[PDB]
């Protein structure tokens, strides 16, 4: 089981970490969501599907910097919604093919009333999402740690 | 502050996510209304009411599946109506007692003019409603995320 | 292989005909589409999937009455678009399960410039769609003929 | 009157449907433009120009897949720009010769601010464009339905 990003780095069999940059709407008002869909960016696959079933959870999502300070959020994982930062590990998604399948994770972030001017800085760490992978074969229990960075500034109108 | 559901589950202190399975009218004609009343499904209470006031909003309500594609309508939160899907956080409702109070949320849904046959599938996700809880005591700001599923097919007859 | 409608009649193994009523937007201007999605109304299944593959086409779509006189159209079948009335039989869709699967057919109908007042009458025949079913097993070649009737009047504003 | 495509197919007299497979820029940044020029792909001619004038509109253009969700923009039909997806039939272009003339349709597409990673998948449907042909001779009113597919992944970098 391994993962890669749309146009860049991989995390190999056994887990590891990678950095992922995301495009954010440059302007967001209170009562609006920024939607950050990682499923167009993070893809995984099962290496031995005919003999092994891999199980993949969102083990933990965490907020950093301007998202931690200036936004509240929810996370959508495989069709179900959760608070963001997360409060528990999700149910598992099954990976059963050598063909890349997106990791179905999307953040929905909304500015709190204090947000104003640059609520998120360009290039800054906004989130960490931890993909936990297991199987029906052996004791493998691996973390794929995704560090989420903002491409651009996000301004909340004052 | 925590919440429970009718013959099911709980989201404990600090928030979290639950699934809510709701019975729907099997038949709703164009022009007719489908009512999804969560006030009979979702109940919350204040844990230290002698000392704390709890504040509770519908932060966001979103439509999914057949409700998203085949219906339009409103959300009534404690007496006032709003568009659904929502565009802003509602006013607060106070929880000031240890005894279960309904979450006063109801969806008022009516078929699009072109809908017919099976407009909602049994077992499908129809809505996500986020309960945001704060207080007059500390910095607690918790999301209680309700994933609302149809128990049955809803048919718009033709 | 057989088919049924959402809340009514069946066409049995061997083919046959049925009448299907559809809800139409009561008011349509030039440059707007009426969208008639039969996939919420017509469902089919394979009776012996473990041993037989069924193939299902839209063999022909035809317009009648007010649609023939007052609208031009396209038909969407399993993700691809065609003129309506059709000019040939579609590629086939595979049915490989005893579980009901919709027949993925949707009409997109737009008023011609002459349309005015009641362009479609309530209860009138508007379309015939012919489902042709074959298999990889024997010589079975069957027609499921769907007669499409308007529920309500459709008015084109003058 | 009929139409042909670059190294492919034809829709003959009387209209019909074809698939068009188009090469796309592999990378389009937010702020940048993706151009889908069908003028190099779709060619039509008049069969009896000594005697007949053929009239040709873009009757409707619709977006699908990643183009629908991840892009916004316009359609340029013979020099004038319009919203895409479309809201009205365009002016006519005349075909008055037996020699292939391009269908002068081009999509001008730009990423939504929140798009990143794989915004269009290879092999996926991105658009349907309906060519409506009439004449100055008889009642012929024919639809030529072009189903437009991406040949490659289009990545919005982050
Ligand atoms: C069809 C059938 O019944 N045939 C079986 C054979 O499959 C079986 O041989 C074992 O096959 C399993 C997979 O089914 C192998 O498990 C994977 O091993 C790789 C690599 O490690 C081994 O293989 C290497 C060569 O490829 C060798 O160099 C090395 O010595 C090892 O033997 C791991 O990378 C895999 O784990 C990754 O992918 C899986 C699936 O996505 C994830 O769950 C993991 O977390 C991880 O990401 C597998 O573990 C196994 O190596 C084969 N042999 C044994 C005994 O381990 C054969 C027994 O030999 O029996 C036949 O009947
Ligand atoms: C009458 C009067 O004013 N007397 C006050 C005392 O109240 C005060 O002592 C504080 O009392 C408050 C209750 O009013 C306590 O607050 C609740 O604590 C529980 C449990 O917290 C314990 O366990 C936690 C681990 O989960 C620890 O982190 C924590 O330190 C505690 O040990 C919380 O669960 C409550 O919060 C929930 O319920 C409320 C009400 O529904 C919601 O609003 C919240 O969102 C949340 O769901 C309360 O926070 C508090 O612990 C007591 N101590 C203090 C000050 O922190 C006393 C101070 O000594 O002063 C007297 O005069
Ligand atoms: C797993 C395996 O290899 N086992 C096979 C057996 O399947 C096989 O027995 C034949 O099985 C096939 C299906 O695989 C049968 O075909 C269907 O027949 C029914 C009904 O007609 C028969 O069965 C009736 C009882 O159910 C009998 O009363 C009757 O005498 C017939 O024998 C048809 O309705 C089916 O056709 C419908 O459904 C299919 C699939 O959706 C459509 O394609 C058709 O258009 C139509 O809608 C099938 O034709 C078949 O009847 C079984 N027997 C034979 C010889 O015909 C067995 C051979 O006996 O071999 C085993 O190895
Ligand atoms: C110089 C002059 O004015 N002389 C006229 C003659 O034109 C006229 O005879 C008619 O000539 C026209 C061409 O101008 C003919 O029209 C084309 O016919 C073809 C083929 O149609 C034949 O086959 C059909 C089967 O598919 C039969 O149904 C039909 O009866 C014919 O036998 C069509 O394919 C053409 O239509 C296509 O191309 C045009 C041009 O691009 C498009 O606009 C259309 O949408 C379509 O794609 C034409 O229709 C016509 O057949 C001749 N006869 C008549 C009147 O019908 C002559 C009359 O006798 O008068 C002279 O003065
Ligand atoms: Ni691999
Ligand atoms: Ni309690
Ligand atoms: Ni059956
Ligand atoms: Ni020709």
PDB file of N, CA, C and O in Angstrom, chain B residues 57-111:
ATOM      1  N   UNK B  57     -26.159  26.882  18.238  1.00  0.00           N
ATOM      2  CA  UNK B  57     -26.659  27.298  16.918  1.00  0.00           C
ATOM      3  C   UNK B  57     -26.698  26.141  15.918  1.00  0.00           C
ATOM      4  O   UNK B  57     -25.963  25.159  16.062  1.00  0.00           O
ATOM      5  N   UNK B  58     -27.572  26.262  14.918  1.00  0.00           N
ATOM      6  CA  UNK B  58     -27.345  25.623  13.632  1.00  0.00           C
ATOM      7  C   UNK B  58     -26.330  26.425  12.833  1.00  0.00           C
ATOM      8  O   UNK B  58     -26.686  27.390  12.135  1.00  0.00           O
ATOM      9  N   UNK B  59     -25.077  25.988  12.906  1.00  0.00           N
ATOM     10  CA  UNK B  59     -23.974  26.647  12.221  1.00  0.00           C
ATOM     11  C   UNK B  59     -24.068  26.523  10.710  1.00  0.00           C
ATOM     12  O   UNK B  59     -23.793  27.480   9.989  1.00  0.00           O
ATOM     13  N   UNK B  60     -24.404  25.328  10.235  1.00  0.00           N
ATOM     14  CA  UNK B  60     -24.587  25.092   8.810  1.00  0.00           C
ATOM     15  C   UNK B  60     -25.477  23.879   8.629  1.00  0.00           C
ATOM     16  O   UNK B  60     -25.472  22.968   9.456  1.00  0.00           O
ATOM     17  N   UNK B  61     -26.291  23.919   7.577  1.00  0.00           N
ATOM     18  CA  UNK B  61     -27.070  22.778   7.120  1.00  0.00           C
ATOM     19  C   UNK B  61     -26.824  22.607   5.636  1.00  0.00           C
ATOM     20  O   UNK B  61     -26.928  23.573   4.868  1.00  0.00           O
ATOM     21  N   UNK B  62     -26.476  21.385   5.237  1.00  0.00           N
ATOM     22  CA  UNK B  62     -26.197  21.064   3.846  1.00  0.00           C
ATOM     23  C   UNK B  62     -27.047  19.897   3.381  1.00  0.00           C
ATOM     24  O   UNK B  62     -27.285  18.966   4.143  1.00  0.00           O
ATOM     25  N   UNK B  63     -27.391  19.916   2.095  1.00  0.00           N
ATOM     26  CA  UNK B  63     -28.225  18.893   1.448  1.00  0.00           C
ATOM     27  C   UNK B  63     -27.358  17.922   0.669  1.00  0.00           C
ATOM     28  O   UNK B  63     -26.370  18.332   0.070  1.00  0.00           O
ATOM     29  N   UNK B  64     -27.773  16.650   0.612  1.00  0.00           N
ATOM     30  CA  UNK B  64     -27.048  15.611  -0.138  1.00  0.00           C
ATOM     31  C   UNK B  64     -28.014  14.707  -0.879  1.00  0.00           C
ATOM     32  O   UNK B  64     -29.223  14.749  -0.632  1.00  0.00           O
ATOM     33  N   UNK B  65     -27.478  13.932  -1.815  1.00  0.00           N
ATOM     34  CA  UNK B  65     -28.250  12.914  -2.536  1.00  0.00           C
ATOM     35  C   UNK B  65     -29.502  13.443  -3.207  1.00  0.00           C
ATOM     36  O   UNK B  65     -29.486  14.500  -3.838  1.00  0.00           O
ATOM     37  N   UNK B  66     -30.587  12.688  -3.095  1.00  0.00           N
ATOM     38  CA  UNK B  66     -31.882  13.108  -3.620  1.00  0.00           C
ATOM     39  C   UNK B  66     -32.472  14.374  -3.021  1.00  0.00           C
ATOM     40  O   UNK B  66     -33.269  15.051  -3.667  1.00  0.00           O
ATOM     41  N   UNK B  67     -32.136  14.696  -1.782  1.00  0.00           N
ATOM     42  CA  UNK B  67     -32.609  15.969  -1.228  1.00  0.00           C
ATOM     43  C   UNK B  67     -31.948  17.151  -1.948  1.00  0.00           C
ATOM     44  O   UNK B  67     -32.617  18.116  -2.314  1.00  0.00           O
ATOM     45  N   UNK B  68     -30.644  17.041  -2.183  1.00  0.00           N
ATOM     46  CA  UNK B  68     -29.884  18.047  -2.937  1.00  0.00           C
ATOM     47  C   UNK B  68     -30.396  18.239  -4.370  1.00  0.00           C
ATOM     48  O   UNK B  68     -30.595  19.372  -4.824  1.00  0.00           O
ATOM     49  N   UNK B  69     -30.594  17.138  -5.087  1.00  0.00           N
ATOM     50  CA  UNK B  69     -30.992  17.231  -6.491  1.00  0.00           C
ATOM     51  C   UNK B  69     -32.499  17.430  -6.742  1.00  0.00           C
ATOM     52  O   UNK B  69     -32.880  18.115  -7.690  1.00  0.00           O
ATOM     53  N   UNK B  70     -33.347  16.875  -5.875  1.00  0.00           N
ATOM     54  CA  UNK B  70     -34.775  16.737  -6.170  1.00  0.00           C
ATOM     55  C   UNK B  70     -35.724  17.593  -5.307  1.00  0.00           C
ATOM     56  O   UNK B  70     -36.939  17.590  -5.526  1.00  0.00           O
ATOM     57  N   UNK B  71     -35.183  18.329  -4.339  1.00  0.00           N
ATOM     58  CA  UNK B  71     -36.034  19.082  -3.418  1.00  0.00           C
ATOM     59  C   UNK B  71     -35.497  20.483  -3.227  1.00  0.00           C
ATOM     60  O   UNK B  71     -34.302  20.743  -3.416  1.00  0.00           O
ATOM     61  N   UNK B  72     -36.390  21.389  -2.856  1.00  0.00           N
ATOM     62  CA  UNK B  72     -35.986  22.701  -2.358  1.00  0.00           C
ATOM     63  C   UNK B  72     -36.721  22.961  -1.058  1.00  0.00           C
ATOM     64  O   UNK B  72     -37.643  22.229  -0.704  1.00  0.00           O
ATOM     65  N   UNK B  73     -36.275  23.956  -0.307  1.00  0.00           N
ATOM     66  CA  UNK B  73     -36.983  24.315   0.908  1.00  0.00           C
ATOM     67  C   UNK B  73     -36.188  25.072   1.943  1.00  0.00           C
ATOM     68  O   UNK B  73     -35.192  25.720   1.631  1.00  0.00           O
ATOM     69  N   UNK B  74     -36.655  24.976   3.182  1.00  0.00           N
ATOM     70  CA  UNK B  74     -36.185  25.817   4.276  1.00  0.00           C
ATOM     71  C   UNK B  74     -35.823  24.989   5.507  1.00  0.00           C
ATOM     72  O   UNK B  74     -36.221  23.821   5.634  1.00  0.00           O
ATOM     73  N   UNK B  75     -35.075  25.611   6.419  1.00  0.00           N
ATOM     74  CA  UNK B  75     -34.908  25.069   7.763  1.00  0.00           C
ATOM     75  C   UNK B  75     -35.558  25.988   8.792  1.00  0.00           C
ATOM     76  O   UNK B  75     -35.314  27.184   8.811  1.00  0.00           O
ATOM     77  N   UNK B  76     -36.419  25.422   9.627  1.00  0.00           N
ATOM     78  CA  UNK B  76     -36.957  26.160  10.754  1.00  0.00           C
ATOM     79  C   UNK B  76     -36.155  25.828  12.021  1.00  0.00           C
ATOM     80  O   UNK B  76     -36.156  24.689  12.489  1.00  0.00           O
ATOM     81  N   UNK B  77     -35.437  26.826  12.532  1.00  0.00           N
ATOM     82  CA  UNK B  77     -34.701  26.712  13.797  1.00  0.00           C
ATOM     83  C   UNK B  77     -35.350  27.575  14.883  1.00  0.00           C
ATOM     84  O   UNK B  77     -35.352  28.802  14.784  1.00  0.00           O
ATOM     85  N   UNK B  78     -35.847  26.927  15.934  1.00  0.00           N
ATOM     86  CA  UNK B  78     -36.591  27.606  16.998  1.00  0.00           C
ATOM     87  C   UNK B  78     -37.431  28.769  16.456  1.00  0.00           C
ATOM     88  O   UNK B  78     -37.195  29.934  16.795  1.00  0.00           O
ATOM     89  N   UNK B  79     -38.377  28.448  15.576  1.00  0.00           N
ATOM     90  CA  UNK B  79     -39.447  29.379  15.228  1.00  0.00           C
ATOM     91  C   UNK B  79     -39.189  30.237  14.001  1.00  0.00           C
ATOM     92  O   UNK B  79     -40.130  30.610  13.300  1.00  0.00           O
ATOM     93  N   UNK B  80     -37.930  30.580  13.743  1.00  0.00           N
ATOM     94  CA  UNK B  80     -37.596  31.346  12.544  1.00  0.00           C
ATOM     95  C   UNK B  80     -37.187  30.422  11.390  1.00  0.00           C
ATOM     96  O   UNK B  80     -36.541  29.404  11.608  1.00  0.00           O
ATOM     97  N   UNK B  81     -37.609  30.763  10.175  1.00  0.00           N
ATOM     98  CA  UNK B  81     -37.268  29.982   8.984  1.00  0.00           C
ATOM     99  C   UNK B  81     -36.079  30.579   8.256  1.00  0.00           C
ATOM    100  O   UNK B  81     -35.855  31.782   8.310  1.00  0.00           O
ATOM    101  N   UNK B  82     -35.313  29.717   7.594  1.00  0.00           N
ATOM    102  CA  UNK B  82     -34.120  30.120   6.855  1.00  0.00           C
ATOM    103  C   UNK B  82     -34.028  29.251   5.616  1.00  0.00           C
ATOM    104  O   UNK B  82     -34.593  28.158   5.590  1.00  0.00           O
ATOM    105  N   UNK B  83     -33.300  29.725   4.591  1.00  0.00           N
ATOM    106  CA  UNK B  83     -33.026  28.873   3.430  1.00  0.00           C
ATOM    107  C   UNK B  83     -32.226  27.626   3.814  1.00  0.00           C
ATOM    108  O   UNK B  83     -31.380  27.674   4.712  1.00  0.00           O
ATOM    109  N   UNK B  84     -32.541  26.517   3.153  1.00  0.00           N
ATOM    110  CA  UNK B  84     -31.774  25.282   3.244  1.00  0.00           C
ATOM    111  C   UNK B  84     -31.524  24.752   1.836  1.00  0.00           C
ATOM    112  O   UNK B  84     -32.461  24.620   1.057  1.00  0.00           O
ATOM    113  N   UNK B  85     -30.253  24.464   1.494  1.00  0.00           N
ATOM    114  CA  UNK B  85     -29.072  24.592   2.356  1.00  0.00           C
ATOM    115  C   UNK B  85     -28.870  26.012   2.884  1.00  0.00           C
ATOM    116  O   UNK B  85     -29.303  26.978   2.256  1.00  0.00           O
ATOM    117  N   UNK B  86     -28.195  26.123   4.026  1.00  0.00           N
ATOM    118  CA  UNK B  86     -28.060  27.390   4.746  1.00  0.00           C
ATOM    119  C   UNK B  86     -26.974  28.301   4.175  1.00  0.00           C
ATOM    120  O   UNK B  86     -26.113  27.854   3.419  1.00  0.00           O
ATOM    121  N   UNK B  87     -27.014  29.578   4.563  1.00  0.00           N
ATOM    122  CA  UNK B  87     -26.043  30.582   4.105  1.00  0.00           C
ATOM    123  C   UNK B  87     -25.438  31.361   5.271  1.00  0.00           C
ATOM    124  O   UNK B  87     -24.502  32.150   5.091  1.00  0.00           O
ATOM    125  N   UNK B  88     -25.966  31.130   6.472  1.00  0.00           N
ATOM    126  CA  UNK B  88     -25.407  31.744   7.675  1.00  0.00           C
ATOM    127  C   UNK B  88     -25.755  30.934   8.915  1.00  0.00           C
ATOM    128  O   UNK B  88     -26.757  30.229   8.943  1.00  0.00           O
ATOM    129  N   UNK B  89     -24.910  31.040   9.933  1.00  0.00           N
ATOM    130  CA  UNK B  89     -25.211  30.554  11.268  1.00  0.00           C
ATOM    131  C   UNK B  89     -26.460  31.207  11.858  1.00  0.00           C
ATOM    132  O   UNK B  89     -26.640  32.419  11.761  1.00  0.00           O
ATOM    133  N   UNK B  90     -27.305  30.401  12.489  1.00  0.00           N
ATOM    134  CA  UNK B  90     -28.529  30.885  13.116  1.00  0.00           C
ATOM    135  C   UNK B  90     -28.237  31.614  14.434  1.00  0.00           C
ATOM    136  O   UNK B  90     -27.152  31.477  15.000  1.00  0.00           O
ATOM    137  N   UNK B  91     -29.225  32.369  14.938  1.00  0.00           N
ATOM    138  CA  UNK B  91     -29.256  32.790  16.338  1.00  0.00           C
ATOM    139  C   UNK B  91     -29.029  31.629  17.307  1.00  0.00           C
ATOM    140  O   UNK B  91     -29.159  30.456  16.933  1.00  0.00           O
ATOM    141  N   UNK B  92     -28.685  31.961  18.542  1.00  0.00           N
ATOM    142  CA  UNK B  92     -28.490  30.955  19.562  1.00  0.00           C
ATOM    143  C   UNK B  92     -29.798  30.523  20.220  1.00  0.00           C
ATOM    144  O   UNK B  92     -30.746  31.314  20.359  1.00  0.00           O
ATOM    145  N   UNK B  93     -29.844  29.245  20.582  1.00  0.00           N
ATOM    146  CA  UNK B  93     -30.795  28.737  21.555  1.00  0.00           C
ATOM    147  C   UNK B  93     -30.020  28.397  22.828  1.00  0.00           C
ATOM    148  O   UNK B  93     -28.919  27.839  22.766  1.00  0.00           O
ATOM    149  N   UNK B  94     -30.587  28.764  23.975  1.00  0.00           N
ATOM    150  CA  UNK B  94     -29.965  28.515  25.270  1.00  0.00           C
ATOM    151  C   UNK B  94     -30.358  27.139  25.793  1.00  0.00           C
ATOM    152  O   UNK B  94     -31.527  26.746  25.728  1.00  0.00           O
ATOM    153  N   UNK B  95     -29.376  26.403  26.299  1.00  0.00           N
ATOM    154  CA  UNK B  95     -29.647  25.213  27.084  1.00  0.00           C
ATOM    155  C   UNK B  95     -29.243  25.502  28.516  1.00  0.00           C
ATOM    156  O   UNK B  95     -28.106  25.890  28.776  1.00  0.00           O
ATOM    157  N   UNK B  96     -30.195  25.359  29.433  1.00  0.00           N
ATOM    158  CA  UNK B  96     -30.039  25.826  30.813  1.00  0.00           C
ATOM    159  C   UNK B  96     -30.553  24.802  31.811  1.00  0.00           C
ATOM    160  O   UNK B  96     -30.871  25.143  32.949  1.00  0.00           O
ATOM    161  N   UNK B  97     -30.621  23.546  31.390  1.00  0.00           N
ATOM    162  CA  UNK B  97     -31.122  22.491  32.248  1.00  0.00           C
ATOM    163  C   UNK B  97     -30.490  21.166  31.877  1.00  0.00           C
ATOM    164  O   UNK B  97     -30.122  20.961  30.718  1.00  0.00           O
ATOM    165  N   UNK B  98     -30.429  20.262  32.857  1.00  0.00           N
ATOM    166  CA  UNK B  98     -29.846  18.929  32.706  1.00  0.00           C
ATOM    167  C   UNK B  98     -30.809  17.950  32.056  1.00  0.00           C
ATOM    168  O   UNK B  98     -30.454  16.797  31.791  1.00  0.00           O
ATOM    169  N   UNK B  99     -32.042  18.400  31.840  1.00  0.00           N
ATOM    170  CA  UNK B  99     -33.066  17.551  31.249  1.00  0.00           C
ATOM    171  C   UNK B  99     -33.057  17.742  29.729  1.00  0.00           C
ATOM    172  O   UNK B  99     -32.981  18.877  29.235  1.00  0.00           O
ATOM    173  N   UNK B 100     -33.041  16.623  29.004  1.00  0.00           N
ATOM    174  CA  UNK B 100     -33.039  16.633  27.539  1.00  0.00           C
ATOM    175  C   UNK B 100     -34.034  17.627  26.979  1.00  0.00           C
ATOM    176  O   UNK B 100     -35.224  17.570  27.295  1.00  0.00           O
ATOM    177  N   UNK B 101     -33.532  18.573  26.193  1.00  0.00           N
ATOM    178  CA  UNK B 101     -34.362  19.445  25.391  1.00  0.00           C
ATOM    179  C   UNK B 101     -34.149  19.070  23.913  1.00  0.00           C
ATOM    180  O   UNK B 101     -33.009  18.852  23.476  1.00  0.00           O
ATOM    181  N   UNK B 102     -35.248  18.987  23.135  1.00  0.00           N
ATOM    182  CA  UNK B 102     -35.106  18.821  21.689  1.00  0.00           C
ATOM    183  C   UNK B 102     -34.177  19.876  21.094  1.00  0.00           C
ATOM    184  O   UNK B 102     -34.138  21.026  21.558  1.00  0.00           O
ATOM    185  N   UNK B 103     -33.400  19.476  20.092  1.00  0.00           N
ATOM    186  CA  UNK B 103     -32.810  20.443  19.182  1.00  0.00           C
ATOM    187  C   UNK B 103     -33.903  20.848  18.192  1.00  0.00           C
ATOM    188  O   UNK B 103     -34.409  20.015  17.434  1.00  0.00           O
ATOM    189  N   UNK B 104     -34.323  22.121  18.246  1.00  0.00           N
ATOM    190  CA  UNK B 104     -35.494  22.538  17.486  1.00  0.00           C
ATOM    191  C   UNK B 104     -35.190  22.789  16.002  1.00  0.00           C
ATOM    192  O   UNK B 104     -35.312  23.918  15.521  1.00  0.00           O
ATOM    193  N   UNK B 105     -34.809  21.736  15.279  1.00  0.00           N
ATOM    194  CA  UNK B 105     -34.486  21.861  13.849  1.00  0.00           C
ATOM    195  C   UNK B 105     -35.462  21.013  13.047  1.00  0.00           C
ATOM    196  O   UNK B 105     -35.711  19.855  13.383  1.00  0.00           O
ATOM    197  N   UNK B 106     -36.050  21.616  12.014  1.00  0.00           N
ATOM    198  CA  UNK B 106     -36.900  20.881  11.081  1.00  0.00           C
ATOM    199  C   UNK B 106     -36.665  21.346   9.649  1.00  0.00           C
ATOM    200  O   UNK B 106     -36.541  22.540   9.385  1.00  0.00           O
ATOM    201  N   UNK B 107     -36.557  20.388   8.735  1.00  0.00           N
ATOM    202  CA  UNK B 107     -36.418  20.692   7.317  1.00  0.00           C
ATOM    203  C   UNK B 107     -37.782  20.651   6.652  1.00  0.00           C
ATOM    204  O   UNK B 107     -38.536  19.699   6.817  1.00  0.00           O
ATOM    205  N   UNK B 108     -38.069  21.680   5.865  1.00  0.00           N
ATOM    206  CA  UNK B 108     -39.310  21.761   5.121  1.00  0.00           C
ATOM    207  C   UNK B 108     -39.013  21.649   3.633  1.00  0.00           C
ATOM    208  O   UNK B 108     -38.505  22.589   3.014  1.00  0.00           O
ATOM    209  N   UNK B 109     -39.299  20.476   3.075  1.00  0.00           N
ATOM    210  CA  UNK B 109     -38.799  20.139   1.740  1.00  0.00           C
ATOM    211  C   UNK B 109     -39.904  19.858   0.745  1.00  0.00           C
ATOM    212  O   UNK B 109     -40.820  19.071   1.010  1.00  0.00           O
ATOM    213  N   UNK B 110     -39.776  20.457  -0.430  1.00  0.00           N
ATOM    214  CA  UNK B 110     -40.770  20.298  -1.477  1.00  0.00           C
ATOM    215  C   UNK B 110     -40.133  19.996  -2.830  1.00  0.00           C
ATOM    216  O   UNK B 110     -39.188  20.672  -3.247  1.00  0.00           O
ATOM    217  N   UNK B 111     -40.682  19.000  -3.544  1.00  0.00           N
ATOM    218  CA  UNK B 111     -40.103  18.546  -4.814  1.00  0.00           C
ATOM    219  C   UNK B 111     -39.918  19.672  -5.839  1.00  0.00           C
ATOM    220  O   UNK B 111     -40.765  20.569  -5.960  1.00  0.00           O
TER     221      UNK B 111
END
